[PDB]
Design a protein around this motif. Structure first.
Motif, PDB file in Angstrom:
ATOM      1  N   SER A   1      26.458  31.024  35.366  1.00 32.98           N
ATOM      2  CA  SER A   1      25.814  31.683  36.589  1.00 32.98           C
ATOM      3  C   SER A   1      26.816  31.826  37.681  1.00 32.98           C
ATOM      4  O   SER A   1      26.743  32.771  38.504  1.00 32.98           O
ATOM      5  CB  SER A   1      24.424  31.184  36.890  1.00 32.98           C
ATOM      6  OG  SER A   1      23.970  31.822  37.890  1.00 32.98           O
ATOM      7  N   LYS A   2      27.471  30.672  37.931  1.00 29.55           N
ATOM      8  CA  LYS A   2      28.438  30.985  39.004  1.00 29.55           C
ATOM      9  C   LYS A   2      29.425  31.991  38.991  1.00 29.55           C
ATOM     10  O   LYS A   2      29.864  32.298  40.126  1.00 29.55           O
ATOM     11  CB  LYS A   2      28.961  29.502  39.202  1.00 29.55           C
ATOM     12  CG  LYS A   2      27.969  28.355  39.622  1.00 29.55           C
ATOM     13  CD  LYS A   2      28.608  27.051  39.706  1.00 29.55           C
ATOM     14  CE  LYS A   2      29.776  27.019  40.742  1.00 29.55           C
ATOM     15  NZ  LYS A   2      30.276  25.685  40.826  1.00 29.55           N
ATOM     16  N   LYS A   3      29.785  32.536  37.929  1.00 31.99           N
ATOM     17  CA  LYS A   3      30.382  33.708  37.675  1.00 31.99           C
ATOM     18  C   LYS A   3      29.963  34.894  38.312  1.00 31.99           C
ATOM     19  O   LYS A   3      30.659  35.875  38.976  1.00 31.99           O
ATOM     20  CB  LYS A   3      31.007  33.879  36.322  1.00 31.99           C
ATOM     21  CG  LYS A   3      31.877  32.959  35.847  1.00 31.99           C
ATOM     22  CD  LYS A   3      32.479  33.237  34.647  1.00 31.99           C
ATOM     23  CE  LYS A   3      32.918  32.150  33.784  1.00 31.99           C
ATOM     24  NZ  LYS A   3      33.376  32.099  32.303  1.00 31.99           N
ATOM     25  N   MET A   4      28.654  34.873  38.693  1.00 29.05           N
ATOM     26  CA  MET A   4      27.934  36.138  38.838  1.00 29.05           C
ATOM     27  C   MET A   4      27.898  36.319  40.340  1.00 29.05           C
ATOM     28  O   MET A   4      26.941  35.634  41.144  1.00 29.05           O
ATOM     29  CB  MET A   4      26.832  36.344  38.291  1.00 29.05           C
ATOM     30  CG  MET A   4      25.914  37.583  38.449  1.00 29.05           C
ATOM     31  SD  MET A   4      27.075  38.941  37.580  1.00 29.05           S
ATOM     32  CE  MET A   4      26.308  40.452  38.327  1.00 29.05           C
TER      33      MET A   4
ATOM     34  N   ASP B   1      35.028  37.723  36.404  1.00 29.75           N
ATOM     35  CA  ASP B   1      36.094  37.710  35.216  1.00 29.75           C
ATOM     36  C   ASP B   1      36.386  39.165  35.337  1.00 29.75           C
ATOM     37  O   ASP B   1      37.737  39.362  34.999  1.00 29.75           O
ATOM     38  CB  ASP B   1      35.461  37.233  33.977  1.00 29.75           C
ATOM     39  CG  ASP B   1      35.452  35.793  33.955  1.00 29.75           C
ATOM     40  OD1 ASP B   1      36.090  34.910  34.483  1.00 29.75           O
ATOM     41  OD2 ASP B   1      34.475  35.334  33.084  1.00 29.75           O
ATOM     42  N   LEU B   2      35.808  40.110  35.769  1.00 31.11           N
ATOM     43  CA  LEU B   2      36.056  41.273  35.744  1.00 31.11           C
ATOM     44  C   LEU B   2      37.317  41.718  36.666  1.00 31.11           C
ATOM     45  O   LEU B   2      37.603  42.720  36.968  1.00 31.11           O
ATOM     46  CB  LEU B   2      34.845  42.192  35.779  1.00 31.11           C
ATOM     47  CG  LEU B   2      33.786  41.992  34.836  1.00 31.11           C
ATOM     48  CD1 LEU B   2      32.670  42.605  34.938  1.00 31.11           C
ATOM     49  CD2 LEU B   2      34.487  41.971  33.112  1.00 31.11           C
ATOM     50  N   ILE B   3      37.183  40.824  37.853  1.00 34.96           N
ATOM     51  CA  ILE B   3      38.017  41.160  38.864  1.00 34.96           C
ATOM     52  C   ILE B   3      39.680  41.188  38.503  1.00 34.96           C
ATOM     53  O   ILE B   3      40.105  40.265  37.860  1.00 34.96           O
ATOM     54  CB  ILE B   3      37.808  40.159  39.889  1.00 34.96           C
ATOM     55  CG1 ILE B   3      36.621  40.431  40.837  1.00 34.96           C
ATOM     56  CG2 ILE B   3      38.872  40.030  41.109  1.00 34.96           C
ATOM     57  CD1 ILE B   3      36.156  39.418  41.576  1.00 34.96           C
ATOM     58  N   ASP B   4      40.422  42.157  38.819  1.00 41.39           N
ATOM     59  CA  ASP B   4      41.579  42.173  38.398  1.00 41.39           C
ATOM     60  C   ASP B   4      42.570  40.957  39.209  1.00 41.39           C
ATOM     61  O   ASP B   4      42.742  41.212  40.264  1.00 41.39           O
ATOM     62  CB  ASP B   4      42.345  43.667  38.662  1.00 41.39           C
ATOM     63  CG  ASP B   4      41.751  44.270  37.749  1.00 41.39           C
ATOM     64  OD1 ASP B   4      41.127  44.273  36.588  1.00 41.39           O
ATOM     65  OD2 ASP B   4      41.673  45.666  38.086  1.00 41.39           O
ATOM     66  N   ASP B   5      43.160  39.969  38.400  1.00 46.74           N
ATOM     67  CA  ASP B   5      43.893  39.130  38.604  1.00 46.74           C
ATOM     68  C   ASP B   5      45.512  39.540  38.635  1.00 46.74           C
ATOM     69  O   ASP B   5      46.290  38.689  38.790  1.00 46.74           O
ATOM     70  CB  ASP B   5      43.899  37.671  38.287  1.00 46.74           C
ATOM     71  CG  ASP B   5      42.415  37.147  38.932  1.00 46.74           C
ATOM     72  OD1 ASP B   5      41.802  37.601  39.694  1.00 46.74           O
ATOM     73  OD2 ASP B   5      41.844  36.257  37.672  1.00 46.74           O
TER      74      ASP B   5
END
Lengths: 102, 49, 640, 431, 100, 28, 307
Positions: free
Chosen positions: A16-19, A26-30
């Motif tokens: 839940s901490k990813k949200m 995780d969907l953020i472009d690194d």
RNA sequence: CAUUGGUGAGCAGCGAAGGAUUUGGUGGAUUACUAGCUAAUAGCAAUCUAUUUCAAAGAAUUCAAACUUGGGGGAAUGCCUUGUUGA
């Protein structure tokens, strides 16, 4: 078949901490953070699924077992995964499977 | 250990009334007005246009 | 008693026991050490993770704890351990036969106090040195000087003076000289607990009658006094936030907060720890922060916080009552019946005589949660019958779990002690399931099992009846009647074809389950207490009353191995993951390791505390035992 | 948390700081007297003229406002903004204004206090910074049109969330919603710390001190079911009534009687608490009109409790104190009142204390009993003490006349207590 | 004036400048070694700086009928309802009953 | 509406203690 | 105040009062942003393409050009947005007309540090050579090159008067240059961990960021040898210049640091969030209200936007 | 006659000092637990400053650098590239 956070289809329940309020973390472009040029160049085509190269996804690879067959000889069966072709077997025989003991 | 910081006090610079115009405090230090020659050129260049 | 197969890993599920926890400060963060019997633990205070447990068990119980910044000072029977990261780096032995009651640290000195009114001083050998090592001198207190030592405190800004509090009065010892620089006056009450103050020259005092006495040392007088009705004060602490607050912890489970400025109490906490196991053994406001940490003897540790005041201008008068924050939990009572949850050895169900089941975690020790007991509102619409003052479920004596269909309906069936029904539990939601399973012949449930498919729930009544309830709806399907005495174990094979049962009449009945026909029926000599099936090889083992394990093949319908060697009642046993071993524990205080091919014990473990349950992992790695005394679960690493 | 939660937290701390002109034309435009268009077009210099002219009228009504013209209402205190000053200096601006709203709250119906506080509203920003002591001083005027204006300015604190539907409303906040304020356990803890602050300055006025109790009665009334709620309530209410009896003022003391009698009927308090309360009622009881109310407490307090030791003799320090402030003739004129309250369970504890402590005046102890019809067990519990007294006291003829009153009425009751203790013929032989 | 005097607390002489933390105790740069009576004086004043003195320690000490008789007995009790009495009179509106 | 009681997220601010380990001085 | 997350925040806060203009969550990475011509129009430096946003959060332009932007800056008397990314090139975008004025090949590699010169409107790139390079949209060569430090250049800053420069190379060094005569005043050698960011105040106060540290000096920019900033005075020597004010964060690594212009704080941007450290000597106390108003209504702004 | 439609009166039945729906806030999880800080072989954690400096080491394409551009056509003036005039 596999326990990887790197692959997509593993977890029944994501953390839940990813949200964050706008979207998963995780969907953020690194990709732009990376030091080299060759990593930063996103050439992923828009809706390419199971396409040509692994760069052209802009997704993590899915978990799928495509084709499965038994072995002819020795109780083995190979399942062809995303991670690569698995082989299961019984060549250990560390197991007490008795038959008709007195 | 005497400490003084910048206090604007909000009462001098923004007026009390609504009808009173805003006061407009000026500092003629040339460090804060950087482009002396270039501006007055292009004020005259707007003046001829 | 050294085993060849097993070796202990750690004990799972214990937090505190009654010994006062002592906090240490790193930088700006705080760590709590507690103890568990002969092995102490370390908790962070920012999220209550487990950070460090000690590397070896101590030879006896840790009696007192204290911690200066990196080094945890642990004090068992005759010695004082000076521990860093749970590693014994210097063992300090005190030269008496007396047992050490209390301990204190300041400066270059260590101050340990044995029970026979004697105080030992240990100096830092060098100011570069971090732990004090050299024996300085032996301070004694004769009984004409004061009573038995309550505690040792070192107050702020006293050069080598040691505030020794006794049951009668208060002393001061200049440990450089060794001389009594000041003695106080005698108190009318027996002192129980002392604690310093963030003000100068003041120690706080706690009596067996409910009186807190502020006591000055420069004036040698009582400044303030606080009377409490009907309580034995067990812990004291001061909030150092900048707001004056005293926390009095009783031995009747109450925690009481005062406001020394307003001379008033603020809010009194009721039963934050159990009265019977000791109440609030230690409570401490963390330094400069609105967090009090309470740890009773009932195997818990809780943090309470003060919210900021709702008043804008008033502030210190309108005070928010304290608020529950994070905690850790264990069994207060010893565990009756445990099981493993999954194949990767990642959760363990543990049900104890505290009446509260717990899903402990072998993997990460902050992941353990009590399974909730909050009944689902019925499908039917009529209301649930139960007492409105909610009490916990009666203690659990038989548990069964098949993990195959988890997260979709119930997969845990538990049989409570002396109830004609037997409830169900969902594993994933951590909750009592919505269905309860009845026996339909008014017998007590002594044994339960589930199908490997996770659709059928077996119930073995104490009157022979084996009702088989379905697991979606909790509906009744089939009722088997072969036994006449109590059924004491059911199983279904891996193929869902054949079914066994064992009674106290000696009958081991072999059922078909696809058809409803009785395949056959076998009778042994003694009554049969329990059964462990092994679904991989269709071997199952029985525990008889003639003190022998009988292993019976499930296909060929005959005794294959019979194991002699015990000398009292066999409590519990389990097969290995590969069927190659049976580990059984009995009331002869032994834990043996049977070997099914060769038919004999290969390892015999004499444990002084008798082991109630032994369960292998489904994986081939861990062995968990539950004993009669103690609260937690001993985990054995498998050398095999 | 999020961003906009933290970034609205900065807005509360700069609620008064005039930054843009539009920010000033919203803050300065709100006030007590002038409407929103004519308020924004006037200086502080204009407002200070009307205030200092009005404040000198309030100094004539009472001289206590003369000091604030030296400090707050002075001519030099126009240039000082709150926001410029340090943290220690602001708390002194609060402690002046907190001392101001005590003296202001009494003369609040009058027109000059409306023009006086408005400069202390508009220059000193009390409708934002300290609106607790602004509202707690003026919480008793809820029906009036001046409190409706006070609601139309204030951003309400988190504790006054009951009135939050009445801000800029047409009709005044009704009487029950004032009770929903006081029903909270936290809002009472202000109104204690407001009142114990208000008694120390000895400026508590009659209409204010009614509206305190008329709410403090109802809070006991709305919680008469929940015995847990009352159990946590009296560290708030009885600690007022303890400090409300310490007042020199006779008017404050009668308010303590209203709360004590109401709470005692709603919850049976312990024997030790009632004897504690009966001392503090006795100790500071000076004026005339406070005494009449005080006697109907102890009349009513002793009937609230019931149990073992219900009719016990009064302690020594209690009884002579009660004889000090209440006369034995004055207690007889009390019983002859045609109101005739239920004095029933107290006097049988009063009469027994006479029988043990004083004993000089048992002429009264007859005349007490003719005036009150007692209960059945009480007369037996009296007569046991006198028969103990009959043996011990050096025998006296007026004690014989007391039993002659009980030979008149309930003869068998005299016999059954003698048949419990002693002999039938021995008592008549003793006299 | 204290109730006790330590004789050897004066004889002791401590160097300040060794430990990293104690170097805030020195008044001037020249001093390095201070005797125990002045060292323990300076160490109190820094202990003031970490924990300020609250109101209750200094100004306040505990050392006809009184006025505080109602406040004191409220402090000495925590439960106010007369449940200890065994009154033999039945309380209204709340009936203790247990179904068998 | 009654008084909105909402617990706030509590962060541990930093603080400091008087060290007892400085309270010992060497022999003269 | 404008802030950008490295992952997705862009928040154009009003800062004194608590209002919030625009909060854009961008799932591309973002490096830096500045307000261009008012509070209203700002310009972030995305993963690849510098965007031009509005006060509401709207996009106004996706700049096809400016194809890498690590360092982004505006200079307000020319309406001339400037970028220099990881591509070497240096592009100036005249944001009133939208016509790109001048695209300049830097020849020196990826721009490691860029900060404008306020007095002069030349700009100073910093490279992996250590050669701080002055640029101008008319000439396609650098105006003057300056070997500031060895290794690369972590950051630079320029005094508001235009006289003075401060560079911080990644060779644990720090230079104080005089831009009027191109001679380095004095060189801080072997500061213990290399200063990632500097900034110059308006009164002339220096800033430095070792990464968890923030260090300030007073009168560092003068010409005497006594003005040479030092971490500590032996014996209380008055000729040696102690640091003015220091602060260290707990577990952070700061990214930039800029003073607030017309008050005396410095806005520090660290990994968890934002603090403003209160510095008394920092900002200039008396501005010029024709030029830049801290106190500026709607009508006073949009008439000064046209002017 | 049928409702697989809405409202609303009742009863059987379930029924331990009450029941049901909805929601604010915080905590613990959501991967496998070896403590905080800094200038880090050590010190702090009440603080690094009136030891924080010197010395040492440390300078390649003799000045490689848009692997990054939506497609047609142009590019006067720019810029780039080469050639040239002059000092």
């Amino acid at each position: 078949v596999s326990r990887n956070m790197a692959l997509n289809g593993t977890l029944e329940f994501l953390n839940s901490k990813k949200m964050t309020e706008a979207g998963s973390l995780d969907l953020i472009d690194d990709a732009g953070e990376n030091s080299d040029l060759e990593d930063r160049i996103d050439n992923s085509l828009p809706g390419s699924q199971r396409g040509g190269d692994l760069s052209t996804r802009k997704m993590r690879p899915e978990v799928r077992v495509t084709s499965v067959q038994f072995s002819p000889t020795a109780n083995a069966f190979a399942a062809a995964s995303t991670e690569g072709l698995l082989i299961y077997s019984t060549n250990d025989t560390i197991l007490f499977d008795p038959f008709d003991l007195d | 250990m005497k400490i003084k910081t910048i206090k604007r006090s909000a009462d001098d610079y923004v007026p009390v009334k609504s009808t009173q115009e805003s006061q407009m405090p000026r500092n003629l230090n040339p460090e804060l007005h950087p482009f002396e020659r270039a501006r007055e050129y292009t004020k005259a260049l707007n003046a001829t246009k | 008693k050294n085993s060849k197969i097993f070796s202990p890993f750690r004990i799972i599920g214990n937090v505190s026991n009654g010994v006062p926890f002592a906090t240490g400060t790193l930088g700006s963060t705080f760590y709590i050490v507690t103890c568990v019997g002969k092995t102490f633990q370390i908790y962070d205070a920012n999220t209550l993770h487990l950070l460090f447990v000690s590397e070896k068990e101590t030879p006896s119980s840790i009696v007192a704890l204290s911690a200066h910044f990196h080094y945890v000072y642990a004090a068992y029977e005759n010695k004082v351990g000076i521990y860093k990261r749970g590693i014994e780096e210097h063992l300090l032995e005190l030269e008496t036969d007396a047992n050490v009651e209390h301990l204190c640290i300041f400066g270059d000195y260590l101050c340990a106090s044995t029970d026979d009114n004697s105080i030992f001083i240990y100096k830092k050998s060098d100011p570069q040195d971090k732990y004090p090592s050299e024996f300085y001198t032996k301070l004694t207190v004769t009984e004409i000087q004061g009573g038995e030592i309550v505690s040792l405190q070192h107050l702020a800004t006293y050069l080598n003076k040691l505030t020794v509090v006794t049951k009668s009065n208060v002393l001061l010892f200049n440990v450089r000289t060794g001389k009594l620089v000041f003695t106080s006056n005698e108190f009318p009450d027996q002192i129980t607990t002392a604690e310093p103050a963030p003000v100068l020259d003041i120690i706080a005092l706690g009596t067996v009658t409910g009186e807190v006495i502020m006591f000055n040392m420069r004036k040698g007088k009582r400044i303030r006094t606080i009377k409490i009705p009907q309580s034995r004060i067990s812990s004291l602490s001061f909030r150092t936030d900048g707001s004056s607050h005293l926390s009095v912890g009783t031995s009747s489970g109450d925690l009481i907060f005062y406001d020394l400025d307003r001379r008033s109490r603020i809010h009194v906490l009721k039963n934050i720890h159990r009265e019977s196991y000791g109440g609030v053994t230690q409570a401490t406001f963390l330094n400069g922060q609105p967090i009090i940490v309470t740890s009773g003897g009932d195997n818990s540790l809780k943090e309470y916080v003060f919210d900021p005041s709702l008043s804008q201008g008033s502030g210190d008068v309108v005070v928010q009552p304290p608020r529950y924050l994070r905690s850790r939990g264990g069994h207060s009572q010893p565990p009756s019946y445990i099981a493993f949850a999954d194949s990767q050895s990642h959760f363990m169900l543990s049900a104890s005589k505290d009446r509260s089941l717990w899903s402990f975690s072998l993997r990460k020790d902050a992941q353990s949660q009590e399974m909730s007991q909050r009944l689902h509102k019925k499908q039917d619409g009529g209301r649930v019958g139960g007492s409105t003052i909610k009490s916990k479920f009666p203690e659990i004596v038989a548990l069964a779990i098949e993990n195959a269909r988890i997260g979709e309906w119930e997969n845990i069936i538990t049989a409570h002690k002396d109830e004609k029904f037997a409830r169900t539990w969902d594993m994933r939601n951590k909750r009592v399931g919505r269905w309860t399973f009845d026996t339909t012949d008014d017998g007590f449930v002594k044994s339960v099992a589930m199908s490997q498919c996770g659709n059928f729930g077996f119930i073995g009544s104490s009157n022979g009846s084996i009702t088989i309830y379905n697991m979606q709806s909790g509906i009744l399907r089939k009722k088997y009647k072969l036994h006449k005495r109590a059924v004491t174990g059911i199983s279904l094979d891996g193929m869902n074809r054949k079914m066994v049962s064992c009674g106290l009449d000696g009958i081991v009945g072999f059922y078909d389950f696809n058809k409803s026909t009785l395949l056959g029926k076998l009778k042994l000599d003694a009554p049969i207490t329990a059964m462990v099936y092994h679904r991989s090889s269709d071997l199952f083992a029985l525990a008889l009353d003639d003190l022998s394990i009988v292993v019976i093949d499930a296909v060929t319908q005959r005794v294959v191995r019979q194991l002699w060697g015990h000398s009292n009642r066999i409590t519990a046993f389990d097969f290995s993951p590969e069927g190659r071993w049976i580990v059984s524990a009995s009331l002869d205080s032994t834990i043996r390791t049977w070997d099914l091919p060769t038919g004999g014990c290969i390892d015999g473990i004499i444990v002084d505390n008798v082991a109630t349950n032994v369960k292998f992992s489904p994986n081939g790695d861990l062995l968990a035992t539950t004993h009669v005394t103690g609260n937690g679960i001993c985990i054995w690493t498998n050398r095999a | 948390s999020s961003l906009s939660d933290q970034l609205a937290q900065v807005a509360s701390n700069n609620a008064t700081v005039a930054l843009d002109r539009k920010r000033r034309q919203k803050l300065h435009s709100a006030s007590l007297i002038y409407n929103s268009k004519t308020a924004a077009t006037q200086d502080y210099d204009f407002i200070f003229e009307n205030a200092s002219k009005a404040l000198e009228e309030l100094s004539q009504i009472e001289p206590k406002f003369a000091i604030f013209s030296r400090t707050l209402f002075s001519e030099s205190s126009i240039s000082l903004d709150r926001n410029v000053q340090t943290k220690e200096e602001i708390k002194d601006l609060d402690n002046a204004i907190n001392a101001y709203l005590l003296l202001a709250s009494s003369k609040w119906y009058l027109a000059p206090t409306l023009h006086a506080t408005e400069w202390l509203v508009r220059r000193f920003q009390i409708h934002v910074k300290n609106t607790e002591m602004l509202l707690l001083s003026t919480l008793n005027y809820y029906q009036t049109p001046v409190f409706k204006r006070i609601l139309s300015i204030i951003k309400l604190p988190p504790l006054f969330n009951c009135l939050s539907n009445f801000v800029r409303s047409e009709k005044p906040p009704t009487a029950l919603t004032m009770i929903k304020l006081f029903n909270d356990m936290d809002f009472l803890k202000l109104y204690t710390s407001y009142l114990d602050q208000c008694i120390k300055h000895n400026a508590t006025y009659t209409n204010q001190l009614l509206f305190t109790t008329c709410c403090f009665i109802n809070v006991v009334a709305f919680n008469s079911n929940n015995d847990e709620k009352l159990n946590q309530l009296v560290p708030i209410l009885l600690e007022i009534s303890a400090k409300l009896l310490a007042s020199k003022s006779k008017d404050c003391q009668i308010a303590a009687h209203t709360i004590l009698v109401v709470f005692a009927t709603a919850l049976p308090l312990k024997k030790t608490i009632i004897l504690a309360a009966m001392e503090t009622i006795l100790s500071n009881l000076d004026a005339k009109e406070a005494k009449h109310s005080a006697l109907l407490t102890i009349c009513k307090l002793f009937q609230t409790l019931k149990g073992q030791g219900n009719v016990d003799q009064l302690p020594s320090k209690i009884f002579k104190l009660f004889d000090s402030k209440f006369d034995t003739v004055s207690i007889l004129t009390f019983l002859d009142k045609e109101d005739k309250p239920v004095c029933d369970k107290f006097i049988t504890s009063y009469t027994r204390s006479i029988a043990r402590y004083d004993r000089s005046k048992l002429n009264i102890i007859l005349s007490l009993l003719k005036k009150i019809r007692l209960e059945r067990y009480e007369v037996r519990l009296i007569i046991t003490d006198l028969i103990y007294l009959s043996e011990i006291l050096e025998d006296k003829s007026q004690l014989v006349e007391l039993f002659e009153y009980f030979i008149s009425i309930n003869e068998d009751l005299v016999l059954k207590c003698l048949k419990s203790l002693g002999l039938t013929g021995x008592x008549x032989x003793x006299x | 004036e204290a109730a006790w005097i330590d004789s050897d607390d004066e004889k002791i002489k401590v160097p300040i400048l060794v430990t990293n933390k104690t170097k805030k105790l020195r008044t001037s740069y020249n001093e390095s070694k201070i005797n125990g009576v002045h060292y323990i004086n300076r160490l109190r004043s820094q202990f003031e700086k970490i924990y300020p003195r609250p109101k209750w320690v200094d100004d306040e000490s505990d050392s006809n009928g009184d006025i505080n008789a109602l406040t004191k007995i409220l402090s000495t009790t925590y439960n106010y309802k007369d449940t200890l009495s065994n009154s033999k009179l039945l309380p209204p509106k709340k009936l203790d009953i247990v179904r068998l | 509406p009654k008084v909105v009681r909402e617990a706030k997220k509590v962060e541990m601010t930093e603080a400091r203690a008087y060290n007892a380990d400085a309270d010992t001085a060497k022999a003269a | 105040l404008l802030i950008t997350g490295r992952k997705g925040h862009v928040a154009s806060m009003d800062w004194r009062k608590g209002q919030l203009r625009a909060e854009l969550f961008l799932n591309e990475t973002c490096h830096s942003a500045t307000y261009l011509q008012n509070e209203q129009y700002f310009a972030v430096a995305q993963k690849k393409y510098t965007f031009i946003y509005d006060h509401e959060g709207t996009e106004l332009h996706r700049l096809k050009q400016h194809i890498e932007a690590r360092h982004l800056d505006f200079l307000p008397y020319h309406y001339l947005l400037v970028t220099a990314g990881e591509t070497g090139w240096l592009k100036y975008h005249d944001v009133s007309t939208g016509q790109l004025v001048s695209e300049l090949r830097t020849k020196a590699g990826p721009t490691m540090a860029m900060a404008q010169n306020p007095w002069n409107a030349v700009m100073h790139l910093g490279h992996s050579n250590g050669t701080v390079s002055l640029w101008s949209p008319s000439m396609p060569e650098p105006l003057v090159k300056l070997l500031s430090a060895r290794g690369p250049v972590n950051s630079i800053a320029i005094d508001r008067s235009g006289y003075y420069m401060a560079t911080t190379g990644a060779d644990r060094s720090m230079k104080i240059w005089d831009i009027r005569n191109f001679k380095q005043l004095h060189s801080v050698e072997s500061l213990p961990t290399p200063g990632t960011n500097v900034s110059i105040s308006d009164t002339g106060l220096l800033a430095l960021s070792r990464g968890p540290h923030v260090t300030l000096w007073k009168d560092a920019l003068k010409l005497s040898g006594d003005s040479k900033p030092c971490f500590g005075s032996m014996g209380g020597n008055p000729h040696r210049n102690t640091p003015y004010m220091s602060h260290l964060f707990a577990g952070n690594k700061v990214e930039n640091l800029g003073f607030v212009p017309f008050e005396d704080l410095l806005g520090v941007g660290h990994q968890t969030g934002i603090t403003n450290l209160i510095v008394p000597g920092a900002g200039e106390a008396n501005y010029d209200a024709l030029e830049l108003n801290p106190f500026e209504t709607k009508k006073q702004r949009q008439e000064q936007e046209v002017r």
